[PDB]
Write the structure tokens for this entry.
Amino acid sequence: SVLFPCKYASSGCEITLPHTEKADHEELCEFRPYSCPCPGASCKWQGSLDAVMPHLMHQHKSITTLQGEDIVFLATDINLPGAVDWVMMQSCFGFHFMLVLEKQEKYDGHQQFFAIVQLIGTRKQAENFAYRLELNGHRRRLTWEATPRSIHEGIATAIMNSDCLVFDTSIAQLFAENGNLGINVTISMC
Ligand SMILES: [Zn+2]
Ligand SMILES: [Zn+2]
């Protein structure tokens, strides 16, 4: 049983495991760098958790940040052929929750939206929360509630498995007013 240091020991991590069992700790390890949480898979910054807020303050100034624990995100122009994602930050409970709406294109000539929120915080910190996403309309409500993913884990593997609010364009137009979609976001503790 010959032991190896974790890949991220050069960041402070002091664990040593057998060459096989690296996988587990190696991507649960808190010393793993955080990738830029923006749904834009085009900004490939990395760095430490404390640095994430700086990096968005600096390189993603166009992100609207919202009041408190129950807000309404107005995603504008969801039917624009060019529009592909909306993003914004919600400040409550002394944390920040990044809300991202990703438009993707599948079988139809149409698109599906995916909506999910992540916590600016650890995997452990994120389990103490839940979030709810509401699309509201005339005698209609589509709701999704789940546990926000930590930015450490990311949303890509959750988008992949539809583990978030999921809708296509005809659902959008049911709830879209003009070309804008109002998404009620509620964060809570648990
Ligand atoms: Zn480690
Ligand atoms: Zn970035």
In short: The domain at 59-189 is CATH 2.60.210.10 (Apoptosis, Tumor Necrosis Factor Receptor Associated Protein 2; Chain A). The first strand starts at residue 3 and ends at 5. Helices lie at 22-28, 49-59, 123-126, 156-160, 169-175.
